[PDB]
From a paper:
In two intra-subunit mutant forms A(L172)C+L(L246)C and A(L37)C+S(L99)C (pairs 3 and 4, respectively), the formation of disulfide bonds did not occur. This can be attributed to the fact that these cysteine pairs were too deeply immersed in the membrane and were therefore inaccessible to the bacterial disulfide bond formation systems that promote the oxidation process. In the case where the mutant pairs are located deeper in the membrane part of the RC (pairs 3 and 4), no bonds are observed, and the side groups of the amino acid residues are turned away from each other. The only exception is the A(L172)C+L(L246)C mutant form, in the absorption spectrum of which a short-wavelength shift of the long-wavelength maximum of the special pair absorption band is observed. It is likely that the reason for these changes may be associated with the location of one of the introduced cysteines (L172) in close proximity to the histidine amino acid residue L173, which acts as a ligand for the magnesium atom of BChl PA. Similar to what was observed in the absorption spectra, the amplitude of the QY P band was noticeably reduced in the RC A(L172)C+L(L246)C. the possible reason for these changes may be associated with the location of one of the introduced cysteines (L172) in close proximity to a ligand for the magnesium atom of BChl PA. According to the data obtained, the mutations made for the formation of intra-subunit disulfide bridges (A(L37)C+S(L99)C, A(L172)C+L(L246)C, and A(L53)C+I(L64)C) did not contribute positively to the stabilization of the RC but, on the contrary, had a destabilizing effect on the structure of the complex.
The photosynthetic reaction center (RC) of the purple bacterium Cereibacter sphaeroides (recently renamed from Rhodobacter sphaeroides) is a photosensitive membrane pigment-protein complex that serves as a convenient and informative test model for studying the mechanisms of electron transfer, photosynthesis, and pigment-protein interactions. The RC from С. sphaeroides consists of three protein subunits and ten cofactors arranged in two membrane-spanning branches, A and B. The RC contains two bacteriochlorophylls (BChl), PA and PB, combined into a special pair P, two monomeric BChls, BA and BB, two bacteriopheophytins (BPhe), HA and HB, two quinones, a non-heme Fe atom, and a spheroidene molecule. Of the three protein subunits of C. sphaeroides RC, M and L, are pseudosymmetric with respect to each other and have 5 transmembrane α-helices, whereas subunit H has only one transmembrane α-helix, which is mostly located outside the membrane on the cytoplasmic side. Here we present an approach for stabilization of the photosynthetic reaction center of Cereibacter sphaeroides, which is the formation of disulfide bonds between its α-helices.
Numbering used by the authors:
A (entry chain M): 1 to 302
B (entry chain H): 10 to 249
C (entry chain L): 1 to 281
The structure:
């Protein structure tokens, strides 16, 4: 049983790490939290601290209000019955306004007006969380890659429930707030638009969701294959190539003819994932607006 | 040819542009390619060498520029087995001691890696105030057995990644009372022994030593690690 | 040609089959017995696709479809133009994939690195074998397998899933999806985190790993660690594919109905039997 660095053998533990200061407003930084011996089997045991300033608090406030808006609507649709509430929890659904309400905000509360209010609260939670992921990196002297890669995911989200329904002309076109209901909507959307499998931006989004899973299995296993030389210390391998990085690249060069660097596999990785929703966003923006039937269009063009 | 037509064709032109960016970014080490005698290769492919980039290294350690002129900065005791290219190069001496094949090290910085605050990243636990084994079989004091099934020493310390609170090395006390370091990723900790399938006991002393007792350099780490992993190929004559 | 640091690694040793006979490189590509084999198996399979292409009568990659035998051949064999080519081609691909993971293992031995990689690939091989072997056999016929066509294999996914109402309601399908999304979420953050430290703001020195930990602690309240995120990436990606393999192996053999019917087990549950109110009452 030649040990494989999947789970830790000996967890060790000392003083909590308070982290870099740099320019972080320590006033807005919470204290350090408990240590999870259970999470130490897989990674770091230390829990916390968190930052929580103006932006994070605005984010969690609206984010909660989106959650309590959808929930109270479930609580209403269940006759306020704490047993009907758990029965149908995955069947409840806050639906946007019916189409002939268009993009009007005068749609009544119980018939679309509540969807507009959670969607406001959720719009604010995301974007001020997005602003948070940016400032967190500024405060520490880091590049902004996290916020940029996050704006990739926001993009398909702004498309589903905002940009595309606007261009379609009614809120009805957005995605309902419900477990099963949003899946029904996803099925319906492909049928309405002539089989999405033929939307060439969808078939790209898939290649990247798959390829994102290919690449992290590739990368996650490689770094574990060369952790026996400190390979996970990627910064100092970037800084100062060690046999770990040389051995990682050569496995791949011998295996498939070409290889990355310890920096550059991170560019492959950021882009492979980011492209998932960049293409996914484009193919959805284009459905119903410019292309009605993707299968028929697949015959006209290519 | 419509907006969606335009779109998709544009995305594939972007995409080809992005793969071109990424491959060249991934040429900032090891390039240009060399002949097997170590002079510039005739042929390099279609992707060019990337424009240098620099990293300013913290704690005054300087700056890195890549691609820069590559040199192994170490004697390589190996030699072509073959006239034309593509064949093994066989080790001319002891590959383990000489650092080749699965035993390779890199001339890394003979300095220790520093954390954010400028202290050594790695420290033996009995130099790391407050650090202790927190779960799983605490291995200090355990005899260390090699792949010959004979004992090589006894564990005296655990060397920890402070910022990240992980066992990295077992310090191991050999027959002469001196010690070597053993990678944690290369040992099996058991209730009554530590087993090292990579080396036989007789080899434990060929582990490269550290020139100081409470720190280790990246140069040292690299020598210590590649040698232990070199035993999988090279101490297998003794694995039964 | 070689990477400027590659020479000291091109040593003899580490082969699993054939001793030193195949211990060499072709350009950057290692050879070894299983690259011999990979070449053989993948060479044959490509010929028989080219054959299967001259029978169909088209040399367009986007129309070429090697179809599995008819449902009515059960698990037998078929003529080359009625499934036999799909059957051999499937055997060359399985040979090519297994060979490829084994050649990788020789490479792990020569370079003295972990065997994590070919083990992770082997999950992709299980997934393939699940759709082309384990599932069709359990159902009793090769014809239940997906064809080798660029678009026909998407029609196969299409046709198959809509046999079960919405394949969305398959509870293992949702666990596989959740893992696939979370893998992509994690690969984005993790590449972005390293790049944000390797390439800090202008007028700054290259950040450190502590700077990485603090970013994520500030952001979400926990840093899994640089070793943990790579274990997480591996666990995440293999779990997606293992639940894919689950979600399919149980579909057709031990579950037959509209996959949404499965979720009557929660609704008809006794402790809220017949209540007036909600969606289902
Ligand atoms: C519809 C669109 C709607 C979608 C909405 C959201 C879009 C998604 C955003 C995508 C970003 C993901 C990647 C993140 C990343 O790598 O960040 C690096 C980097 C990190 O930023 P930083 O740390 O703050 O700044 C430091 C430096 O920039 C330097 O930092 P660094 O050195 O660490 O990083 C270098 C980076 C920095 O480069 C940049 O400045 C980034 C470029 C902008 C990002 C947008 C890319 C997506 C474009 C859409 C595709 C269109 C298809 C239609 O280099 C690149 O990104 C180079 C890209 C290669 C270009 C591809 C070549 C195509 C040419 C085609 C010709 C060939 C064909 C021949 C036949 O990002 C940027 O520099 C800014 C990116 C801008 C993001 C959006 C801002 C407002 C718009
Ligand atoms: C996984 C569940 C379903 C499935 C459902 C879908 C759906 C749904 C979609 C695809 C899509 C694709 N699928 Mg499929 N597909 C499956 C099984 C496979 C197998 C296989 C051996 O099992 C292969 C090789 C492919 C191959 C492919 C490509 C045509 C395409 C992009 C994949 C990608 O980037 O993946 C990640 C891999 C990488 C990034 C690495 C590079 C992969 C290369 C491109 C694969 C080349 C195959 C080549 C054309 C055929 C072999 C050449 C031979 C010598 C003849 N599918 C099973 C049956 N697949 C998408 C598409 O565009 O379809 C037209 C799409 O929308
Ligand atoms: C029957 C159903 C249809 C179909 C209909 C659709 C539709 C409709 C859509 C997709 C889309 C997707 N499809 Mg399809 N699809 C089908 C068949 C498939 C198959 C397959 C094997 O058959 C596969 C693998 C896929 C694959 C995929 C992905 C490539 C893509 C989703 C990317 C993603 O991560 O979204 C998930 C990620 C996001 C949605 C981004 C979220 C970002 C936001 C900002 C995060 C908010 C969090 C929130 C505030 C909560 C915080 C809570 C607190 C943390 C507690 N499709 C068939 C043909 N598919 C999408 C797409 O882009 O198509 C082009 C899409 O919308
Ligand atoms: C109409 C379509 C149905 C549906 C029906 C199905 C069916 C049917 C199946 C899936 C399967 C999948 N679906 Mg579903 N699914 C739907 C909606 C979705 C949506 C969505 C957004 O709505 C998503 C995200 C998904 C997600 C997924 C994943 C769970 C899974 C695909 C990955 C996988 O299995 O990889 C597994 C990976 C492989 C098979 C790849 C193996 C590759 C081999 C080992 C190597 C190939 C090398 C190649 C030949 C090399 C070329 C040369 C080199 C490139 C040089 N489905 C709708 C409702 N879905 C599939 C699944 O679970 O499969 C197990 C499946 O069969
Ligand atoms: C490459 C694109 C992929 C991706 C990327 C991506 N996502 C990202 C990022 C990136 C790069 C971030 O930086 C950003 C982030 O912050 O990451 C940590 C994020 C993120 N991606 C998220 C989700 C997400 N990403 C997804 C997808 C993906 N994101 C793509 C696959 C998906 C789906 C559907 O596949 C989801 C759900 C979030 C984790 C986060 C964005 C967070 C945000 O803006 O949140 C606003 C909300 C709040 C601040 C609070 C909400 C509160 C809850 C509603 C309350 C419920 C809890 C209950 C009341 C608790 C009770 C008491 C407890 C003690 C139990
Ligand atoms: C389990 C996590 C992910 C995973 C992991 C993974 N895959 C891997 C690896 C790893 C860790 C490798 O080491 C290995 C590799 O070398 O990657 C570069 C591989 C790899 N994954 C690949 C592809 C791939 N992986 C996929 C999936 C996944 N791979 C998972 C998401 C997918 C899809 C559809 O999701 C594809 C297409 C290859 C690039 C590579 C394996 C290359 C290989 O095996 O080459 C040997 C075989 C040949 C050179 C040719 C075989 C030719 C056949 C005989 C004829 C064609 C038969 C085939 C069935 C036809 C298909 C037709 C299509 C229309 C369907
Ligand atoms: C830190 O480490 C890291 C690196 O290194 C520093 C790495 O590079 C990698 C590896 C990752 C990359 C290089 C980034 C790009 C990779 C992807 C996005 C994954 C997708 C990859 C492909 C689609 C490549 C496909 C090519 C294949 C499958 C091989 C091509 C095959 C041939 C043309 C010949 C194959 C050889 C044969 C037939 C056998 C013997 C040879 C003869 C000719 C005989 C990782 C993960 C990493 O973590
Ligand atoms: C314990 O119970 C209580 C009551 C305390 C609870 O809190 C329980 C709560 C719940 C059970 C709620 C759980 C929620 C769900 C099951 C719903 C799941 C939701 C989803 C899966 C969302 C799917 C996709 C949603 C999308 C795509 C949203 C897009 C948002 C828009 C981009 C935002 C745009 C904003 C607009 C249009 C607002 C317009 C108005 C302005 C002023 C701008
Ligand atoms: C068990 C339940 C099954 C579902 C799966 C649950 C896991 C949730 C993952 C969230 C991804 C966000 C965190 C992962 C991204 C970490 C980014 C990173 O690169 O971390 C490096 C390290 O933290 C500093 O060095
Ligand atoms: C809410 C107060 C947070 C401080 C508590 C610190 C928790 C660390 C306790 C160590 C316990 C280890 N254990 C038993 C959980 O594995
Ligand atoms: C940044 C990494 C680049 C990897 C891109 C992989 C391309 C996969 C090709 C899938 C083809 C999609 N489509 C719709 C044209 O069939
Ligand atoms: C892009 C998806 C599939 C295309 C095949 C993969 C590209 C070939 C990779 C091997 C290149 C090695 N080589 C010959 C350049 O040295
Ligand atoms: C989808 C993965 C394929 C992307 C191709 C990326 C680069 C391939 C060619 C690299 C050339 C390496 N070489 C042989 C010049 O050393
Ligand atoms: C995935 C785990 C979730 C991590 C979130 C942790 C938040 C940190 C808050 C710790 C609180 C400290 N203290 C003592 C003020 O309670
Ligand atoms: Fe990494």
């Amino acid at each position: 049983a030649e040990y494989q660095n999947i789970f830790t053998q000996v967890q060790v533990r000392g003083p909590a790490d308070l982290g870099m200061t740099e320019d972080v407003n320590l006033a807005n930084r919470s204290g350090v939290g408990p240590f999870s011996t259970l999470l130490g089997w897989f990674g770091n045991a230390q829990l916390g601290p968190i930052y929580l300033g103006s932006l994070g608090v605005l984010s969690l406030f609206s984010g909660l209000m989106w959650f309590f808006t959808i929930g109270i609507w479930f609580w209403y649709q269940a006759g306020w019955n704490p047993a009907v509430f758990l029965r149908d929890l995955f069947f409840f659904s806050l639906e946007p306004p019916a189409p002939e309400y268009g993009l009007s905000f005068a749609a009544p509360l119980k018939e679309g007006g509540l969807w507009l209010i959670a969607s406001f609260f959720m719009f604010v939670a995301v974007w001020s969380w997005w602003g948070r992921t940016y400032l967190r990196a500024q405060a520490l002297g880091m590049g902004k890659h996290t916020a940029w890669a996050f704006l990739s995911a926001i993009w398909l989200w702004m498309v589903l429930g905002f940009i595309r329904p606007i261009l379609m002309g009614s809120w009805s076109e957005a995605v309902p707030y419900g477990i099963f209901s949003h899946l029904d909507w996803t099925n319906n959307f492909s049928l309405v638009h002539g089989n999405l499998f033929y939307n060439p931006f969808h078939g790209l989004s898939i290649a990247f969701l798959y390829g994102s899973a290919l690449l992290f299995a590739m990368h996650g296993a490689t770094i574990l294959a060369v952790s026996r030389f400190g390979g996970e210390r990627e910064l100092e391998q970037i800084a100062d190539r060690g046999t770990a990085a040389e051995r990682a690249a050569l496995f791949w060069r011998w295996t498939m003819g070409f290889n990355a660097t310890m920096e550059g596999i991170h560019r492959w990785a950021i882009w492979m994932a980011v492209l998932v929703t960049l293409t996914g966003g484009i193919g959805i923006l284009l459905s119903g607006t410019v292309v009605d039937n993707w299968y028929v269009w697949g015959q006209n063009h290519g | 040819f419509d907006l969606a037509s335009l779109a998709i064709y544009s995305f594939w032109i972007f995409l080809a542009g992005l793969i071109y960016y990424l491959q060249t970014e991934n040429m900032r080490e090891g390039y240009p390619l060399e002949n097997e005698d170590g002079t510039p290769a005739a042929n390099q492919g279609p992707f060019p060498l990337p424009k240098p980039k620099t990293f300013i290294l913290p704690h005054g350690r300087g700056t890195l520029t890549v691609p820069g002129p590559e040199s192994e900065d170490r004697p390589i005791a190996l030699a072509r087995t073959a006239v034309s290219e593509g064949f093994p190069h066989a080790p001319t001496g002891d590959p383990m001691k000489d650092g080749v094949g699965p035993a390779s090290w890199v001339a890394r910085r003979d300095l220790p890696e520093l954390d954010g605050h400028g202290h050594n990243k790695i420290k033996p636990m009995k130099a790391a105030a407050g650090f202790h084994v927190s779960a799983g079989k605490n291995p200090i004091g355990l005899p260390v057995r090699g792949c010959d099934l004979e004992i090589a020493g006894k564990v005296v310390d655990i060397w920890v990644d402070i910022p990240e609170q992980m066992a990295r090395f077992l310090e191991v006390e050999l027959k002469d009372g001196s010690t070597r370091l053993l990678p944690m990723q290369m040992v099996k900790v058991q209730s009554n022994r530590v087993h090292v399938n990579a080396l036989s006991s007789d080899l434990f002393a060929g582990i490269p030593t550290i020139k100081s007792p409470t720190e280790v350099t990246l140069l040292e780490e690299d020598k210590i690690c590649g040698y232990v992993a070199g035993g999988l190929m090279y101490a297998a004559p003794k694995r039964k | 040609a070689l990477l400027s640091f590659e020479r000291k690694y091109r040593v003899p040793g580490g082969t699993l089959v054939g001793g030193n006979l195949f211990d060499f490189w072709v350009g950057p590509f290692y050879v070894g017995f299983f690259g011999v084999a990979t070449f053989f198996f993948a060479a044959l399979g490509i010929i028989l696709i080219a054959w299967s292409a001259v029978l169909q009568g088209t040399w367009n990659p986007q129309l070429i479809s090697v179809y599995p035998p008819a449902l009515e051949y059960g698990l037998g064999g078929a003529p080359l133009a009625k499934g036999g080519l799909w059957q051999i081609i499937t055997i060359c691909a399985t040979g090519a994939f297994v060979s490829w993971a084994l050649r990788e293992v020789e490479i792990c031995r020569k370079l003295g690195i972990g065997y994590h990689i070919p083990f992770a690939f082997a999950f992709a091989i299980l997934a393939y074998l699940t759709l082309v072997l384990f599932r069709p056999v359990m159902m009793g016929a090769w014809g239940y397998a997906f064809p080798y066509g660029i678009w026909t294999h998407l029609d196969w996914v299409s046709n198959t899933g809509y046999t079960y109402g919405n394949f969305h309601y398959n509870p293992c399908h949702m666990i596989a999806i959740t893992f696939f999304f979370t893998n992509a979420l994690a690969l984005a953050l993790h590449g972005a985190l390293v790049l944000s430290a390797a390439n800090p703001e202008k007028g700054k020195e290259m950040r450190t790993p502590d700077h990485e930990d603090t970013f994520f602690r500030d952001l979400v309240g926990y840093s899994i660690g640089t070793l943990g995120i790579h274990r997480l990436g591996l666990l995440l990606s293999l779990s997606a594919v293992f639940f894919s393999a689950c979600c399919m192996i149980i579909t057709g053999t031990i579950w037959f109905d509209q996959w949404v019917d499965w979720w009557q087990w929660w609704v008809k549950l006794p402790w809220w039997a017949n209540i007036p109110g909600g969606i289902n009452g």
